[PDB]
């Protein structure tokens, strides 16, 4: 019995222990193992496996024993015995990820290596003790050594993917080692050369690049790592050489955003690329415009706009996700504001694309199936951190002029009355940003009587001034002044 495996380890006959561990490995390698008899009668097995993990095990049966380690690490109620200091020492020593034993190991094949990698990510996903002990032990310098040692090592997708996934878990949990990798090791530089190796598959590079699934998911996970590390207090942190490195990441993302991932990973690929594109230095952002003229190119105002049109298409494709908006729609909108605000052909192009579909002049400013109508309906959503994003978007795309803003938006007073201090004074001024006072169509006829916060229906005729004033009718101040 697999219950009797823990008793067979007590006698410790090598064939019995190894064969029972082998068959238990191929049986229970799946997620969510045994249900009743494991929290009382496999924690003993967990204790004895931690004890035999403490000594260095023999050169054979390693995959089997470490697979049992991984399998018992899949359960929840054995991490307390598998997440100690010396157990983490043994698992890192077999993992070759600790700096305590770096010039030691004779050249290991990748199989036991990736198995130990899997045990490490299984523990570090769900042990805060392992979070503390990883921040204590500083595995990330040897992890950075491994991720830097790729152009000469032929390490495949499984080992590669899995140890940078371990990096993603540690950088998701520990902000101290986040900033430690940020400053102390130039993780953006090492991640950019990792991104160059992922893109270097050469997928008919002169037409649109087409990344296959393995390297696609590697690029997706290293973009998770990049977004994990790139956000922290970077908003106005400008340097020339660091801005050049950020610009190299920007032009690499420019070449990457117009791609298509294999299988069905293209949407999540695009979302992670724009997530990485979001929090960069905005002065370094406008290199998204820096695209040449080409055959098959949406040339507007003499300049290319193909990647901006593509990410606008991504925005319209992404908007339909109604269960989780603030993940999916915020960073594209913010980066579209910043690239629109730093470039007059960008501002003029999007101001000529999304705004000047006017509504039918009668009906309300929120009904209609157009994208402008979608953004109008989105601006009153109860998420403040998408409503301010869309408000800033329509303001900076409306050429920073409030009478243009009210001339198609009725709630824009409630939008921008707090964005600036009321907006009815000198602030967000008259446009030196081209901006001439002539936007026109056959519209504004009804806006010659522009009853503005509503669409302007002229049916306001109940007067009701029956006698005098305030007679039980506007003497409601007597309950008001306390308020």
């Amino acid at each position, epitope marked *: 019995e697999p219950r009797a495996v823990a008793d067979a380890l007590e006698t410790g006959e090598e064939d019995a222990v190894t064969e029972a561990l082998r068959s238990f490995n191929r049986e229970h390698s799946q997620s969510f193992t045994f249900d009743d008899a494991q929290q009382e009668d496999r924690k003993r097995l967990a204790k004895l496996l931690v004890s035999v993990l403490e000594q260095g095990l023999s050169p054979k049966h390693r995959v089997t024993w470490l697979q049992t380690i991984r399998i018992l690490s899949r359960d929840r109620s054995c991490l307390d015995s598998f997440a100690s200091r010396q157990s983490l020492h043994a698992l890192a020593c077999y993992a070759d990820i600790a700096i305590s034993e770096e010039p030691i190991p004779q050249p290991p094949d990748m199989d036991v290596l990736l198995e130990s990698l899997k045990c490490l990510c299984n523990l570090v996903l769900s042990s805060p003790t392992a979070q503390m002990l990883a921040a204590e032990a500083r595995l990330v310098v040897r992890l950075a050594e491994r991720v830097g040692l790729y*152009r000469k090592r032929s390490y495949p997708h499984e080992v590669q993917f899995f140890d940078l996934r371990l990096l993603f878990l540690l950088t998701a949990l520990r902000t101290d080692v986040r900033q430690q990798l940020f400053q102390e090791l130039h993780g953006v*530089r090492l991640l*950019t*050369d990792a991104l*160059e*190796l992922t*893109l*270097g598959v*050469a997928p008919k*590079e*002169n037409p649109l690049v087409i990344l296959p699934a393995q390297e696609t998911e590697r690029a997706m996970e290293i973009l998770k790592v990049l977004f994990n590390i790139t956000f922290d207090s970077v908003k106005r942190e400008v340097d*020339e*050489e660091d801005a*050049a490195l950020y*610009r*190299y990441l920007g*032009t*690499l993302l420019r*070449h990457c955003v117009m791609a298509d991932a294999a299988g069905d990973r293209t949407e999540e690929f695009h979302g992670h690329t724009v997530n990485l594109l979001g929090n960069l230095p905005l002065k370094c952002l406008d290199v998204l415009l820096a695209l040449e003229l080409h055959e098959g190119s949406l040339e507007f105002m003499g300049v290319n706009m193909d990647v901006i049109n593509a990410l606008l298409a991504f925005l319209e494709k992404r908007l339909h996700q109604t269960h989780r908006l603030k993940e999916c729609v915020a960073p594209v909108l913010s980066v579209l504001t910043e690239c629109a605000r730093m470039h007059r052909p960008a501002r003029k192009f999007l101001k000529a694309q999304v705004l000047p579909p006017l509504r039918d002049v009668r009906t309300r400013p929120e009904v209609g199936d157009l994208l402008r109508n979608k953004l109008v309906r989105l601006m009153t959503h109860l998420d403040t951190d998408v409503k301010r994003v869309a408000a800033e978007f329509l303001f900076v795309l409306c050429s920073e002029s409030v009478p243009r803003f009210i001339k198609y938006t009725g709630y824009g007073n409630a939008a921008g009355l707090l964005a600036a201090r009321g907006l009815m004074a000198g602030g967000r001024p008259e446009g030196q940003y081209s901006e001439d006072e002539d936007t026109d169509t056959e519209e504004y006829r009804e806006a010659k009587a522009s009853i503005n916060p509503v669409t302007g229906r002229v049916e306001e005729k109940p007067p009701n001034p029956m006698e005098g004033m305030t007679e039980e009718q506007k003497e409601h101040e007597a309950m008001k002044l306390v308020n």
Partner: nanobody
Framework: GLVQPGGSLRLSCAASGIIFRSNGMAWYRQAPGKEREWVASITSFGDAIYRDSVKGRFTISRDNARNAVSLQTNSLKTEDTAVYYC????????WGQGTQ
């Protein structure tokens, strides 16, 4: 090497150790001292990023399936006569020899 102002040469010295395909070469410049600045770099294909004072004058070429890395700057003033350098961009290996 004491060039009269207005032109230059394709520099084109080869690196030592790795291959010039999917390994983005670049160029650094350095006034005679510690002060050393990046000039320009090219990506996996012919996408060349530049500094401000090299705009228009300077051309960079990774020139794949061709040996060296050629650089044709033109219309030079007296504010370029310094030492330049050439290595890969995303990993900065041991440097070359130098430009007079």
């Amino acid at each position: 090497g004491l060039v009269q102002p207005g032109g230059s040469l394709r520099l084109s010295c080869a690196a030592s150790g790795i291959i010039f395909r999917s390994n983005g070469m670049a160029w650094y410049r350095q006034a005679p001292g510690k002060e050393r600045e990046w000039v320009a770099s090219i990506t996996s294909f012919g996408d060349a990023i530049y500094r401000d004072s090299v705009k228009g004058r300077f051309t960079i070429s990774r020139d794949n399936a061709r040996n060296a890395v050629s650089l044709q700057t033109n219309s030079l003033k007296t504010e370029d006569t310094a030492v330049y350098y050439c290595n890969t961009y995303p990993v900065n290996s041991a440097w070359g020899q130098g430009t007079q």
